[PDB]
Each structure stands twice: as C-alpha cells, then as structure tokens.
Coordinates of C-alpha atoms in Angstrom, one line a residue:
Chain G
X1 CA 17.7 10.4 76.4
X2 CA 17.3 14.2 76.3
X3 CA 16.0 16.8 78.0
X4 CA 13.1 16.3 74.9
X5 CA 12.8 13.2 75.4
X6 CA 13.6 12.4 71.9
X7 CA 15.6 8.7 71.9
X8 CA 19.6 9.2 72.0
X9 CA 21.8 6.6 70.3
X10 CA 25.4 6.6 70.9
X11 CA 26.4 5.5 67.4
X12 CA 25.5 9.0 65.2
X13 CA 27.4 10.6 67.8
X14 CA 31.2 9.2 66.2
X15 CA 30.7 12.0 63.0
X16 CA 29.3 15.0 62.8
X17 CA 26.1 15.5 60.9
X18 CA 26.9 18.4 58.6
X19 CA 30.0 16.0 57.6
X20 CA 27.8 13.7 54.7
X21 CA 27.0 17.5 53.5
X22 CA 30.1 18.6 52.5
X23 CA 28.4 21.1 49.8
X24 CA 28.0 23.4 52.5
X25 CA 31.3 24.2 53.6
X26 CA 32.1 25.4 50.0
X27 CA 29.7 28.3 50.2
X28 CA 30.3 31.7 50.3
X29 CA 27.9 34.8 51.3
X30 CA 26.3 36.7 48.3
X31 CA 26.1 39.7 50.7
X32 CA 22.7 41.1 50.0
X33 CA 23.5 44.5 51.6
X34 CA 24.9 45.8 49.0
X35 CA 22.8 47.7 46.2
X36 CA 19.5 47.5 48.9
X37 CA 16.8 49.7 49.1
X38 CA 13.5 49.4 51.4
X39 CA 11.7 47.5 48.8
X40 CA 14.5 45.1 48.7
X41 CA 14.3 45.0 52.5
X42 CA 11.2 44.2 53.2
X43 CA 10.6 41.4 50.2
X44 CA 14.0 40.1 52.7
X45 CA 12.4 40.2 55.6
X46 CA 8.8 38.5 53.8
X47 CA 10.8 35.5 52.5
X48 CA 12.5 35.0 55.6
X49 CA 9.2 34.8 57.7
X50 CA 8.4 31.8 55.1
X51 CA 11.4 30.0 55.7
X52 CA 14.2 31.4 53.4
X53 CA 16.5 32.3 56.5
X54 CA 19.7 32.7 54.3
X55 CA 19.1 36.0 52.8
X56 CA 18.3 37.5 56.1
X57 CA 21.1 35.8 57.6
X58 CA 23.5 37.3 55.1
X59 CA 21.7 40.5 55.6
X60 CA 22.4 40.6 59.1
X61 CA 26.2 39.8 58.5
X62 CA 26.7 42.6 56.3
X63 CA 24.4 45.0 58.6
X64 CA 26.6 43.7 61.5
X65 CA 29.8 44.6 59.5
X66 CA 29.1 47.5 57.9
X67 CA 27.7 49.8 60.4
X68 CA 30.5 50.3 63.2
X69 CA 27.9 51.7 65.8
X70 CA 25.8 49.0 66.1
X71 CA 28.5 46.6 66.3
X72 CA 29.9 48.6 68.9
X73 CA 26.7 48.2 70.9
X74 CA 26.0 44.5 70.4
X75 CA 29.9 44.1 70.7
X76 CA 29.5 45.5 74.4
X77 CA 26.5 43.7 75.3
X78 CA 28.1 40.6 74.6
X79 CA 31.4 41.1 76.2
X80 CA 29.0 42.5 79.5
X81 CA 28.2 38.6 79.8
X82 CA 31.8 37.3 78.5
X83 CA 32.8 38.9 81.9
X84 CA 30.6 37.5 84.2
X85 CA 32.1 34.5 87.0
X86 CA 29.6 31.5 86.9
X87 CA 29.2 28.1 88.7
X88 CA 27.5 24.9 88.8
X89 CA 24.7 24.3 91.3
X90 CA 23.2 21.1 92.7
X91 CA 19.2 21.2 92.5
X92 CA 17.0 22.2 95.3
X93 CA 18.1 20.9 98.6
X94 CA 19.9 18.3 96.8
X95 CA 21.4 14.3 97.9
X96 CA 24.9 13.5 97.9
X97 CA 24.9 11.8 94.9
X98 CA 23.4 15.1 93.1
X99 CA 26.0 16.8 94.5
X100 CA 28.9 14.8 93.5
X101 CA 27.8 15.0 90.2
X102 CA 27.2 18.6 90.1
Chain W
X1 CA 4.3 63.3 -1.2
X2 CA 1.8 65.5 0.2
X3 CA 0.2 66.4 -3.2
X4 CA -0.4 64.5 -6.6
X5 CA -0.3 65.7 -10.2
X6 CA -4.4 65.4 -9.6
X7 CA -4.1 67.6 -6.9
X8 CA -2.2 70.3 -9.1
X9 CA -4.8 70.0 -11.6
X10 CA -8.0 69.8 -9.6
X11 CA -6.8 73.0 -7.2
X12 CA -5.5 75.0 -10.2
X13 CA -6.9 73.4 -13.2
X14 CA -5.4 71.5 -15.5
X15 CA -4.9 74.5 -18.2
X16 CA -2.7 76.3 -15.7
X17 CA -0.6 73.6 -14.8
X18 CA -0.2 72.2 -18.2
X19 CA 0.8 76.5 -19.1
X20 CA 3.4 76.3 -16.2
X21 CA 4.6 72.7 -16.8
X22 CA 5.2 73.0 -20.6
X23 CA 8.6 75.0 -21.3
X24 CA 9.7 73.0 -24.7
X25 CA 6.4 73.7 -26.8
X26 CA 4.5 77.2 -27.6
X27 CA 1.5 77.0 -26.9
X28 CA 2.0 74.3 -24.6
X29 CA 0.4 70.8 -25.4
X30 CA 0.9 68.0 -22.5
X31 CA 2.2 68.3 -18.6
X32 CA 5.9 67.5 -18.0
X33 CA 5.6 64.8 -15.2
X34 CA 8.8 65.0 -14.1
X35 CA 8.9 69.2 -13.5
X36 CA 5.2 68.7 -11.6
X37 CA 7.6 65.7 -9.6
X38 CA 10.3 68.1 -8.9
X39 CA 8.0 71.0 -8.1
X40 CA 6.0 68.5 -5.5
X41 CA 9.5 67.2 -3.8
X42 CA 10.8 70.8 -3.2
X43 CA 7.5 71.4 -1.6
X44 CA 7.5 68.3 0.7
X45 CA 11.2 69.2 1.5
X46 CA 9.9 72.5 2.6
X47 CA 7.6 71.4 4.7
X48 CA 9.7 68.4 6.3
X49 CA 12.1 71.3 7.1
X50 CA 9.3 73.4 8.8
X51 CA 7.8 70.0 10.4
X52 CA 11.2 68.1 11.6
X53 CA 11.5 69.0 15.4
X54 CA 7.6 68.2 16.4
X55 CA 6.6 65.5 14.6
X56 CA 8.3 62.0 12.6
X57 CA 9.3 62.6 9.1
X58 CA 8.0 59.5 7.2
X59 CA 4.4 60.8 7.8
X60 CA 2.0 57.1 7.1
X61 CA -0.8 59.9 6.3
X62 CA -1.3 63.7 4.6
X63 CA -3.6 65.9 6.6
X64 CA -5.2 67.8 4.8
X65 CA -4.0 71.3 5.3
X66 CA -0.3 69.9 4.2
X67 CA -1.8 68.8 1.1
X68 CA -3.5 72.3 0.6
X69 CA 0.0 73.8 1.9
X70 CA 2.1 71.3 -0.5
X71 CA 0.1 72.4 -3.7
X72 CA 0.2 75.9 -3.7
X73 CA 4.3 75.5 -2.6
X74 CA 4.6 73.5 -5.4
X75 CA 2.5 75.4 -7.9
X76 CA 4.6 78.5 -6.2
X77 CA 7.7 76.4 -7.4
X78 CA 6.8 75.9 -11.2
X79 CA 7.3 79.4 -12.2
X80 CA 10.6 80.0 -13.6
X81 CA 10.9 84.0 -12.2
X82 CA 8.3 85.0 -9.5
X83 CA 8.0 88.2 -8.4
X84 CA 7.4 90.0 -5.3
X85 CA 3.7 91.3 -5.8
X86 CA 2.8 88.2 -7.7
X87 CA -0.5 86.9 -6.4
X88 CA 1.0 83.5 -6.3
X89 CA 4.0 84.6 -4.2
X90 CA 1.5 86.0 -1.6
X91 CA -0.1 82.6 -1.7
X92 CA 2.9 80.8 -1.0
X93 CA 4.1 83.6 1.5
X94 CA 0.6 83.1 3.6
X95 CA 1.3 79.2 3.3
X96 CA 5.0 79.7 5.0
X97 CA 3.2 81.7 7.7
X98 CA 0.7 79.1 8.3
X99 CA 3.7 76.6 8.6
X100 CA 5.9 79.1 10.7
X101 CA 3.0 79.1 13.0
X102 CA 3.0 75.4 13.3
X103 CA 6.4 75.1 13.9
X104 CA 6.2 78.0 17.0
X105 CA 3.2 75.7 18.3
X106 CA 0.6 77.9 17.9
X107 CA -1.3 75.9 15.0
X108 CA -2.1 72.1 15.9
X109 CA -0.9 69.9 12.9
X110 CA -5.1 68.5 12.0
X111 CA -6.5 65.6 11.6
X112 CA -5.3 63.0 8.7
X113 CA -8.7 61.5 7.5
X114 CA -9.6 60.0 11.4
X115 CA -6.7 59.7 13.7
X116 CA -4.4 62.5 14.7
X117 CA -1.0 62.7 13.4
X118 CA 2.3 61.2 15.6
X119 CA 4.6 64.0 17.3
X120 CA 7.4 63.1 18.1
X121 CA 9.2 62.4 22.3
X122 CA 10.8 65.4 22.4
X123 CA 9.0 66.7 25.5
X124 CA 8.7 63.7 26.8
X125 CA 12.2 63.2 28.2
X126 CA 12.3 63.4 31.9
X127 CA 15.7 62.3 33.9
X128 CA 13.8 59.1 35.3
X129 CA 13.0 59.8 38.9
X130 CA 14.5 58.4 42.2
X131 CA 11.5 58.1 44.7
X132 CA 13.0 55.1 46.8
X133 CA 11.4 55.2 50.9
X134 CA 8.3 55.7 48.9
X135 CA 7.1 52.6 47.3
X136 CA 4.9 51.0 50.1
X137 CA 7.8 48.8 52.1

C-alpha cells in the first residue's frame, strides 16, 4: 500500500488516468491577465478559494510570463535547489537489509 | 401649437381678430382660419428657434407663459405693415426679451399645468470616469 494507507492495485497502474479523459489535452489557456483590473482580481482570487482553481491557475501563468522580474526571482530560487547534490539515506541506525535497499 | 384660434379671440377679442384676419371683405365679416393657422405656426417656429438648445422640441405640454408668448407673436404676425412705435410691436418686442432671457438661462421655462417641462442632456455629458483601485477589491 501507500504511505496513506489507501489500498494499491497493480492493475490501474498499466494506463495512465488522465488517458480515458482525453478532453483535456485539447485545451488551451484563455489567459485571464489580460484586460484585468482589481475588481477582476479579486472576484479571481474568491472563486478560486471555492474551488474554481483554473482561472487562478491561468492567472498565475500569465503573471509568471508577463512580468520578467518576478520570474527572474522565482527563476533563481528554483535553480538555487536545481543545484544542490543529494543522496539516499538508510533510517535511524538502520539493519542490513534497510541498507541494501536504500 | 402653443395657442388656439380661442386663444386669439379670448386674449384679443374676437372683433380684433376677426378686423386683422379678414383682408377679402370691407368691413370684415368671418375669421380666415387658415391666416390665424399661419400666424400661430410662425409664432411656434419662433419660439422653437429661441427654445431648441435647452429643451426637446415636440413639447407633450404648453406652459403657460408660451401660450401667452405664442398669442401675442402671433397676433404681432397678422398685421400686414407694423411699425416701430406700434403698441403691438412693443408687445411682441417685450415677448422676444422674455424669450431671449430664457434662452441666456436666466428665466426658468414654468410649469405646464403640474409637472415641469423636459430639458434636454446637454449638460449632462461627462467623458465617463475611470476610477478603477477604487471599487472596494
């Protein structure tokens, strides 16, 4: 099973889910930055906090591509953490089997 | 049509009008309707001129200083030759003042019978107003 504990069966893993929803991949953005003013913005931001996440994630596309200083800055944070060296640790004072497998 | 052939009649009695209106029989007899009709248009045309930029032409109601304004313009407008120290000319020279003065906004156009007459939008217009970052966000 999972971390969750949720059951795991082998079979759903063959196909991806998203594949029986083949609507999705013919979308395209509607790019709500465009023509927005603060009223706009906020009835955006209302919506979203009721579950209607794909105006604000469109916002946040265009807000990411349209202003270059913030992508600048949330382009260097990320690529701070691109850089970084990283391993795989056994747990505390772990067997031999744990270790193999890490 | 600010004033009537009754209104002719009951402002400058019907003798008058009948003496003015008549130009076919001597001594006059009947009222020509359709000189008292002419007379009363040129009147209303006058007025509509002086009246155009502050208020809607097709007034639904008279107020009552147009009609008083419209018959003695119209009884001014029956005399064949008019001269200039004509008691009737000074009448319709005081009227034109009192019009002039509406026009100029210094005279309020009055009261019909109950409800005040319908200027027009001309001061109304305003560009439209961009207040956005102001409407609560």
């Amino acid at each position: 099973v999972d971390v969750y504990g949720n059951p795991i069966r082998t079979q759903q893993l063959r196909e991806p889910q998203t594949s029986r929803l083949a609507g999705l991949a013919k979308e395209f953005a509607q790019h709500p930055a465009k023509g927005l003013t603060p009223a706009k913005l906020a009835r955006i931001l209302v919506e979203a906090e009721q579950g209607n996440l794909q105006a604000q994630a469109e916002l946040f596309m265009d807000m990411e591509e349209r202003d270059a200083h913030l992508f600048a800055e949330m382009s260097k944070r990320k690529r701070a953490i691109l850089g970084l060296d990283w391993a795989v640790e056994p747990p505390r004072n772990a067997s031999a089997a744990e270790k193999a497998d890490a | 049509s600010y004033c009537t052939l009754a209104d002719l009649i009951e402002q400058y009695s019907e003798q008058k009008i009948r003496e003015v209106s008549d130009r076919v029989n001597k001594p006059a007899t009947t009222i020509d309707t359709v000189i008292v009709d002419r007379a009363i248009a040129d009147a209303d045309s006058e007025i509509d001129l002086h009246l155009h930029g502050r208020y809607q032409l097709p007034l639904a109601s008279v107020p009552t200083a147009l009609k008083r304004i419209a018959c003695g313009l119209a009884y001014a407008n029956l005399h064949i030759v008019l001269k200039e120290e004509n008691p009737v000319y000074k009448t319709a020279e005081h009227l034109r003042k009192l019009l002039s003065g509406i026009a100029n906004g210094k005279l309020s156009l009055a009261l019909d019978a109950d409800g005040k007459p319908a200027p027009v939008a001309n001061t109304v217009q305003i560009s439209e107003g961009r207040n956005d970052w102001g409407a609560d966000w």
